[PDB]
Amino acid sequence: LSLRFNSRIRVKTYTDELTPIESSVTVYKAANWYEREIWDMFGVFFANHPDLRRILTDYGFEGHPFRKDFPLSGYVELRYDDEVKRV
Amino acid sequence: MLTLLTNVTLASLLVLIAFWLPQLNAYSEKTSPYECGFDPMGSARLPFSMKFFLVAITFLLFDLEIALLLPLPWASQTNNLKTMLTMALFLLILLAASLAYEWTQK
Amino acid sequence: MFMINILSLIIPILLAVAFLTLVERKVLGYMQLRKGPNVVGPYGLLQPIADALKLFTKEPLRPATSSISMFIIAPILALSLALTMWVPLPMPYPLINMNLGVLFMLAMSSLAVYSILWSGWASNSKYALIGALRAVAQTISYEVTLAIILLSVLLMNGSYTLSTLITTQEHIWMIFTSWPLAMMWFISTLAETNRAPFDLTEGESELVSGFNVEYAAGPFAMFFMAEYANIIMMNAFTAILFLGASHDPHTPELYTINFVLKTLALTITFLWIRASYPRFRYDQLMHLLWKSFLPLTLALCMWHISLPIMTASIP
Amino acid sequence: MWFEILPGIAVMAACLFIPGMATAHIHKFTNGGKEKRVAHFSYQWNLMERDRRIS
Amino acid sequence: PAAHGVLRLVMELSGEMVRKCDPHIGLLHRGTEKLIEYKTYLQALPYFDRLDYVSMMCNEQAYSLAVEKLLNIQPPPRAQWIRVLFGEITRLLNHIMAVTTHALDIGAMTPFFWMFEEREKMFEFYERVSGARMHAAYIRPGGVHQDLPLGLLDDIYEFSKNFSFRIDELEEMLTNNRIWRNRTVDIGVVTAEDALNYGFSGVMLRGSGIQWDLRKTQPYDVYDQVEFDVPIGSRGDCYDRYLCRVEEMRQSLRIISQCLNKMPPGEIKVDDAKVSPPKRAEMKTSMESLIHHFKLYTEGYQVPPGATYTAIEAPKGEFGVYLVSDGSSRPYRCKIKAPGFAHLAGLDKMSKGHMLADVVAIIGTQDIVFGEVDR
Amino acid sequence: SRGEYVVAKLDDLVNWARRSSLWPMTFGLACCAVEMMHMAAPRYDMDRFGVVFRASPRQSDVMIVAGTLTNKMAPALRKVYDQMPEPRYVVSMGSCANGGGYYHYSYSVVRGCDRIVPVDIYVPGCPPTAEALLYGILQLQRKIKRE
Amino acid sequence: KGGRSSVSGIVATVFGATGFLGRYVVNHLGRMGSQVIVPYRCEPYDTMHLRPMGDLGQIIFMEWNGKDKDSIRKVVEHSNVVINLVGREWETKNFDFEDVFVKIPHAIAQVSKEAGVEKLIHISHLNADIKSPSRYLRSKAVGEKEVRAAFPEATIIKPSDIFGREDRFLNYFASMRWFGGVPLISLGKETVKQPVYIVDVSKGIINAIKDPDAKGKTFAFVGPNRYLLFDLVQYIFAVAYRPFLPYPLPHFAYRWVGRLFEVSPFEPWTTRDKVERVHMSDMTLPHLPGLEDLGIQATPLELKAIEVLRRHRT
Amino acid sequence: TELVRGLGMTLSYLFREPATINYPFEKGPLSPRFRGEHALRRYPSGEERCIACKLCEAVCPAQAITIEAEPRADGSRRTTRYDIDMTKCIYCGFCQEACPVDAIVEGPNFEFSTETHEELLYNKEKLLNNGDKWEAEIAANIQADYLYR
Ligand SMILES: NC(=O)C1=CN([C@@H]2O[C@H](COP(=O)(O)OP(=O)(O)OC[C@H]3O[C@@H](n4cnc5c(N)ncnc54)[C@H](OP(=O)(O)O)[C@@H]3O)[C@@H](O)[C@H]2O)C=CC1
Ligand code: SF4
Ligand code: SF4
Ligand code: SF4
């Protein structure tokens, strides 16, 4: 978004499952959270990013969601189990 | 001493009827310390601060001062107030003075 | 039969803290438009005992991490001193004629908060330790100014004995003489008792029920109860000390009939404070004191030292 | 409405009312209407010292 | 209680100062966008109420715009007047909730109860027109659902005339209450440019004095035809943001007047039956009506393939919908901008070295709602 | 003066006691937090029924579970449930956590609230109207009274 | 796949699961997703935590009484298998100590006959073999022999005290610290015992329903090592870290103690019956069908006592 | 000054009449359009309305509904096990809109909180019983509302 000329544009790219595209945090400033987002919602990696790590998930969990494949019901579930007294 | 004893025995009575009454099942993890859900990262250690003693000590040295202020009501009836009155003011000035010195040395 | 007199001092007051709780939810309710407790009463009246029964009936766990001895001894001390401070209080006739019981009121009040320190120390929890610590900060920070202004208002009654403080108020009331000190006494009672704007010990949203957390059923009831003991008690104290009344010895009861009004008139006000102001935060809480209250307490103090000489009006 | 607070508050008063009465009359009950006697100083106690023996 | 039920702000505090707050969102990531993809457009709409749930209408409006652009279709004007009207009542809802609970976090307690009476009277309106007290799936991609009942507008009038005393009395308990001032007046300032780098939105911008505002800037509805004063802040401290909240409440209260005074008769759903389901009296007595009814609910409408980013002035900030029709009746991807997300990202910069209570207040000036953050 | 008579009396006394002033703590996780608050809003005022929201489970008993649950969140929930004093209860609320409700099919939800804690009364809704909630808790008292 | 949603043919009826048994067995049923009909005698409240274990319609509490005949006809009425558990150690008044081990298993057995119940199963302590000390070994021997006489094809559990952290046993001697010392009749080899444990026993029971061969055979469940009682308690306070005081004692006085502590109206910490539970060692007979015959191998106590007793730790 | 001002303000709110309604004994205002418990309902003839066009299944976002129609012996279309589960239903009222014969209806009743999860999962018969309990009431709402539809 540009302010004084109040108008919006939308650049965009493409990426391999494995090629590490660089992080864009420095250029737009408020993109630190997003790098982490897309990293944990996808495989894609951003280079020169200070700290990719999981958000919007459980801890382990592993497989990225939003991979267009990957079942919405996922591969797992928690439940509390009295014999071990733990979820 | 009698009222002290009746008060303390009263309270202790409330304690004993507080524990030896519900008569139910304590067990582990129920008895684990509270930490807003998730378990503690470590037992309580060292919340260190100079900003504690830097003032709290000043508390202690004012409290010693007020300890000297207490005789005043009785001292007021002394036969020779002009001999007294300066001092009655004097300590207060220093009390203030002490504070003043702290006030502005940050 | 002095013992039955003591018992006669201790039962009615506990009843008073219970119904104090209920009044608290009531008035503090109507400030909020919403009615307070009501359905169980008929006028709510039966509530507090149902409440206390709900507590004591409920299981009071002994925490695994806590050392147990301190953890138990603290509540005991809380109710202990909360009640013990009541003894030398002229209504009109003190249960005890201490030569200097005011100073004793300060003594009890000063050992009070120490129980808070243990309450948060043995509780072992992070919130317990942090909240307890800041608690002790605000408390002491207010006891110094507390005791000084109480001194300055006591230079003129004559002496530390309490009954005389009636005699010295056979007309004008102390308050017209030195109200600003009455303000600072009021607020210092508003913080020492750990109340509305000076809210930190409970912490509440700031620290999820503060020091008091790990205590479960009964001990919690004890800290809660003792807290209200101190609130009504400093209120009564202010009442006798800044608001005099007519006293015919032949009909002492008349005086008491007046006195409970004049003190209740104070306690309600705390509640009507509670409904009104956001809490200070631990910086400003101590800022206004050390920076702002205190110097006036001193200047007023020298002033009150100096009136009796200039006015030749020594008590 | 707000007047309905009163049953809650009056119960307070009476409770607090009790000690103030209960002590003041017990004194008269024990002292025979003499309305107790303070003894802040050694001398006044000396008057209660001279007393009791005199009766 | 200050963590709003779903925050885990672990932090390495010193003696009592914070050294760095470390937010961990996702504690309520219900997983929305994956679900949306499997459900047709009309069946996706409720998720949006389930988003910024305090501000339930404006989200719906954001979506219905987001589709109408793809669908190239324009609501009959009356519908636009409702859409703005409830857009504004909702503006008041979020501001009430924001200023209030932000006060409750710092212990004011009372103003809360004084206001939720009113807020309940507003839910009487969602109650009345939508049939639900909240989460009123009422705004439609085609315009609006059922028409609103005749007995309503005077009722809104009677309330709106008297609300101002209430907001005013609130302001008497707060704005002068210098205790409240001292607690929130030097925190937590953000540089006006530095806001822009982090992409702060709505009030978090105006607090630092920058002029920008989407209703004046890139108006989307009858905002062309309403007149109201945007309240710029100055210092960028929580206090200015607060005054912005209040003043924007008053201004919305100005909008309600104008919308009440120019509320044209006409239809409310779009005529295009291919997108808007037929009225019941009609579908039960003519063939095409029943068929388009049937297909609108079975398969649902198709959208031309395409992509877009709409954004509107949701009370917390601009609310942003990026979606891509594949041409099928199930939208392919529907990334949802959450204004709160950026804010909460900017928080730790905004809150270094501040006292631990102040970080609690400053979470509140961020007026964040985690349901929106976790999407 | 049968012992059973006295037992009936004490039964009435403690069960009436506990049922007369229960003290909810609340996971107002999702969006059914707000409806909870309208129970405590003046117009319905939960407090007149004696119930009062007090934080910190150790000082509270019954637990409301408003709003959608999620995976990462669950263990904290089990923690809090364990740290409550007996006689603890809970209350599932809304279509939220009765069983995932709207979000029944996602990787992060944990279906019902039932699958981590032993729920008492259910209060179906989405959100339940605060009043339907009120009927909920009164029903809870009419269940304690049978204890 | 076996799982929480999985069906299985089981329709077990587990009396008295309210105690240390059989929340574990109901669990391992529950991970299978197998239906259960646990019926409560007590109060709903204590039963409440049983609820999660199931999957919506699975677990089904039913009101019953062990004394009414038809009351037990209720919960068996569609059960494919029924599994008795009932047994209070310290003799309640209204349930005289005998019927608990006699009548109830009896009605269970013959009703198991009439309802054509596919399998019946029952528990009795290894020392149930008749002995002058303790009326429980004998009364349980009587109901053992009775159900065997009434439902002969029933397999019968013989577990010499399962080991669990909650356990009413290990926790008990852990809690003997509270009085001061630990009452040993004469220390050392005065008696010697073994523990089956909670999970191993549970897995074994359900495996026993999983075993076609486990018909009328009387299964018995024994700990891997023959721990001496003195060194055992030594290990107890070795893990509880509490001070350890052996407390040698003439045998009669301990029974004077048990008679002293049976007095309490509630649930006494100790009883003369338990006093006879104390000093009598388990028999070492292995030839009976048992735990390993099921194919399950016992989990050693040595790695598992810690979790069991950490709550006692200072 | 302002302190005592605000304090005087809450004094002023003490004297206003309390807003609380006396629930249960009084109950809050609602609307004809309000949504609550579901209930299939009959023709005045006494015949049931539902005809298993099954699109109630096809439009519910939570997909709470499950239907399994089989022919009547008469040969009329009917359900065999219409069912629904309040555990997943979100009370959005799409079903209320969707039905061509206006069979299922989102009933005015809003209170049916219950002890056990298995009760939530309504069977067809349950819905009919709800339709029997309330029919004058529901027909009243729809009578008061349909013109706006
Ligand atoms: N280590 C061990 O504990 C060993 C145990 N065993 C045997 O296996 C069985 C399982 O042991 P465990 O579960 O720990 O014992 P518990 O006491 O824990 O289980 C017995 C349960 O059955 C209930 N019950 C039984 N009969 C009645 C009745 N007539 N009225 C009311 N309630 C009744 C009890 O009370 P309620 O349900 O009413 O609360 C209790 O809940 C026991 O019978 C025991 O003899 C064998 C070897 C070792
Ligand atoms: S109930 Fe309605 S609001 Fe509460 S979570 Fe489920 S959907 Fe969101
Ligand atoms: S619409 Fe109503 S009636 Fe027609 S099928 Fe779906 S449910 Fe049965
Ligand atoms: S209630 Fe709303 S959500 Fe549940 S089925 Fe009927 S329409 Fe679909």
Q: Are strands G155-159 and G220-221 parallel, antiparallel or unpaired?
A: parallel
Q: Is F96 in the pocket of ligand 2 (CB under 6 A)?
A: yes
Beta bridge partners of F123: F93
- What are the E-state strand segments in chain E? 10-11, 21-22, 306-314, 317-325, 333-337
Question: Which residues are CB-contacts of H30 (< 8 A; sequence separation ≥ 6)?
Answer: E127, H108, H110
Which residues does C contribute to its contact with D (CB < 8 Å)? 1, 4-5, 8-9, 12-13, 15-16, 19-20, 22-23, 26-27, 30, 35-36, 41, 43-45, 91-93, 95, 97, 99, 161, 163, 232, 249, 252-253, 255-257, 259-261, 263-264, 268
Which of E143, E71, E31 minimizes the C-alpha distance to E329?
Answer: E71
Cα–Cα distance measured from residue G176 to residue G277, given in angstroms and rounded to the nearest whole number:
15
Quote the tokens at residue C173.
């009331």
Query: Tokens 């179906």 — which residue?
Result: F124
Could you tell me which residues come within 8 angstroms of residue E291 by beta carbon, excluding any fewer than 6 positions away?
Answer: none
What does the block give as tokens for C69? 């001895």
Q: Reduced to 3 states, what is the DSSP secondary structure of residue E17?
A: strand
Residue type, D8: G
Mutational pocket test of ligand 2: of E50, E54, E56, the residue with most ligand atoms within 8 Å of the beta carbon:
E50
Q: Record the tokens describing residue E346, joined without a space.
A: 């900017």
Cα separations (Å) of H110 from C53, C121, C234, F143? 34, 49, 50, 20
**Contact check, Cβ <8 Å, E178/H13:** no
Cα distance between residue G61 and residue G25, in whole Å: 16
Query: Exposure string (b/e) for C266-291, b if CB count within 10 Å is 16 or more?
Result: bbbebbbbbbbbbbbbbebbbebbbe
Is residue F109 exposed (0-12), middle (13-18) or buried (19+ Cβ within 10 Å)? buried
Encoded tokens for G223? 């700990």
List all residues 6 or more positions away from D34 whose beta carbon is below 8 Å from its beta carbon.
D28
Is residue E64 within 8 A of residue E139, CB to CB? The reply is yes
Cα–Cα distance list, C199 to C28, C196, C270, C278, E103 (Å): 16, 5, 12, 9, 15
As a whole number of angstroms, the distance between CA H91 and CA F102 comes to: 10
Sequence-separated (6 or more) residues with CB below 8 Å from residue F117: A80, F65, F77, F78, F81, F90, G52
C-alpha dist (Å) from residue H39 to C161, E70, E131, G230, H134 = 78, 38, 17, 70, 9
Question: Rounded to an integer, what distance in angstroms lies between the CA atom of residue G26 and that of residue G59?
Answer: 9
Q: Rounded CA gap, E140 and E301, in Å?
A: 13
SS3 B2: helix
Please, are residues G122 and G156 in contact by the beta-carbon 8 Å criterion?
yes
Q: Do C278 and E108 touch (CB under 8 A)?
A: yes
DSSP string, G7-51: --S-EEEETTTTBTTBHHHHHHHHHHT-EE---BSS-HHHHGGGG
CB-CB contact of F66 with F33 (8 Å)? yes
Q: Does A57 touch chain F if contact means CB atoms closer than 8 Å? A: yes
Six-digit token pair at C111? 């050992």
Q: Which residue is associated with the tokens 């006739």?
A: C93
**DSSP code, position H87:** T
8 Å CB contact between C15 and D12: no
Q: Report the separation in Å between the CA atom of G81 and the middle of ligand 1, taken as the mean of its atom positions.
A: 19
- The answer to whether the beta carbons of residues E31 and E18 sit under 8 Å apart is no
CB of E104 less than 8 A from some CB of F: no
CB C89 within 8 A of CB C162: yes
CA distance H117 to chain F (A): 7
B90 contact E CB<8A:
no
B20 part of contact set with chain F, CB < 8 Å:
no
Closest CA to C35 of C45, C20, C25: C25
Radius of gyration in angstroms for the set of CA atoms belonging to chain F, rounded to a whole number: 16
B32: chain F residues, CB-CB within 8 Å: 82-83
Distance of CA E162 to the CA centre of its chain: 24
Q: In Å, how far from its chain's centre is CA G307?
A: 20
Q: Which residues 6+ apart lie within 8 Å of F142 measured at CB?
A: none
Are C273 and C198 in contact by the 8 Å Cβ rule? The answer is no
**Ligand 2: residue whose CA is nearest its atom 6:** F96
Backbone angles phi, psi at F39, to 5 degrees: -65, -40
Contacts of F122 in chain H (CB under 8 A): 113-117, 120
Residue type, C312: A
**Is B23's Cβ below 8 Å from some Cβ in F?**
no
Is residue A12 helix, strand or coil? Answer: coil
Q: What is the DSSP secondary-structure string of C273-312?
A: HHTT-----HHHHHHIIIIIIHHHHHHHHHHHHHHHHHTT
Cross-strand partners of G158: G220
User: Crossing angle for the helix pair E152-174 and E110-130, nearest 10 degrees?
Assistant: 160
CB burial of residue G77 (10 Å; 0-12, 13-18, 19+):
middle
Contacts of F77 in chain E (CB under 8 A): none
Helix (H) or strand (E) holding G119: strand G119-123
Q: Do residues G105 and G84 lie in contact, with contact meaning Cβ atoms separated by under 8 Å?
A: yes
Residue of D nearest to H19 (CA): D1
Angle at G200 (CA atoms; ends G194, G203), nearest 5 degrees: 145
Residue with tokens 């996706």: E44
Residue that is written with structure tokens 């006591």 in the block: C154
Concatenating the DSSP letter of every residue in E44-76 gives HHHHHHTSSGGGHHHHHHHHHHHHHHHHT----
DSSP annotation of A45 reads: -
**Cβ-proximal residues to G115 (8 Å cutoff; 6+ apart), any chain:** G73, G76, G77, G79
Give the integer Cα–Cα distance in Å for E312 and E201: 11
Q: What is the DSSP letter of G122?
A: E
Tell me which residue in F48, F52, F55 faces C208 most closely, judged by beta carbons: F55
DSSP assignment string, E72-118: T----HHHHHHHHHHHHHHHHHHHHHHHHHHHHHTT--HHHHHHHHH
CA distance E290 to E293: 5
Residue linked to tokens 């954004």: E311
Inter-CA distances, C44 with C55, D7, F47, F140, Å: 18, 9, 11, 20
Alpha carbon distance F80, F82 (integer Å): 5
| Structure tokens, H92 | 């959005």
Touch criterion met for D and F (3+ Cβ pairs within 8 Å) = no
Length of chain F: 147
Inter-chain residue contact H62 with F95, CB threshold 8 Å = yes
Q: Which residues of E touch C30 (CB under 8 A)?
A: none
Q: Using an 8 Å CB-CB cutoff, list chain E residues near C272.
A: none
Secondary structure (DSSP) of B55-79: HHHHHHHHHHHHHHHTTHHHHTTSS
One-letter amino acid for residue E18 of the chain: V
Residue type, G34: S
Rounded Cα distance between E159 and E260, Å, is: 13
Query: Among E336, F22, F1, A43, which residue's Cα sits nearest to residue C58?
Result: F22
Q: Please state, in angstroms and rounded to a whole number, the distance separating the CA atoms of residues C55 and C21.
A: 14
Q: At which residue do the structure tokens 């004008």 appear?
A: C172
Q: b/e per residue, H25-57, with b = 16+ CB within 10 A?
A: eeebebbbbbbbbbbbbeeeeeebbbebbbbbb
Phi/psi for E158 (5° steps) reads: -60, -35
Nearest to C57 by CA among F135, B6, B33, F23: F23
**Residues whose CB falls within 8 Å of the CB of residue G265, separated by 6 or more in sequence, listed in order:** none
What letter represents residue G103's amino acid? K
Please calculate the CA angle G294-G300-G302 and round it to the nearest 5 degrees: 170
G218 within 8 A of G158, measured Cβ to Cβ: yes
Q: Which tokens is G1 given?
A: 């796949």
CATH architecture observed for domain B1-105: Up-down Bundle (1.20)
Rg (CA), chain E: 21
The subunits that touch chain G, with at least 3 C-beta pairs less than 8 Å apart, are A, B, F, H
Residue E43: in which H helix or E strand, if any? helix E41-49
C-alpha D9: how far from chain center = 24
Task: Find tokens 């059973």 and name the residue.
Answer: F4
DSSP reduced 3-state for B81 = helix
Distance CA E87, CA E97 (A): 15
F55/F23 Cα distance (integer angstroms)? 9
Cα distance from H123 to chain E (closest Cα, Å)?
24
Task: Answer yes or no: do F70 and E30 touch at CB < 8 A.
Answer: yes
Answer whether the bond into residue C42 is a cis peptide, omega within 30°: yes
Among residues G46, G48, G114, G49, the alpha carbon closest in space to that of G79 is found at G114
Q: What is the DSSP letter of H106?
A: B
Angle at which helices G69-76 and G103-114 cross, to 10°: 50
DSSP annotation of C93: S
Q: Assess contact for G217 and G37: CB atoms under 8 A.
A: no
Collapse the DSSP code of F53 into the 3-class scheme (helix H, G, I; strand E, B; otherwise coil) and give the result.
Answer: coil
**Sheet-wide strand order for F122-123:** F25-26, F63-65, F91-93, F122-123
- How many residues appear in chain G? 314
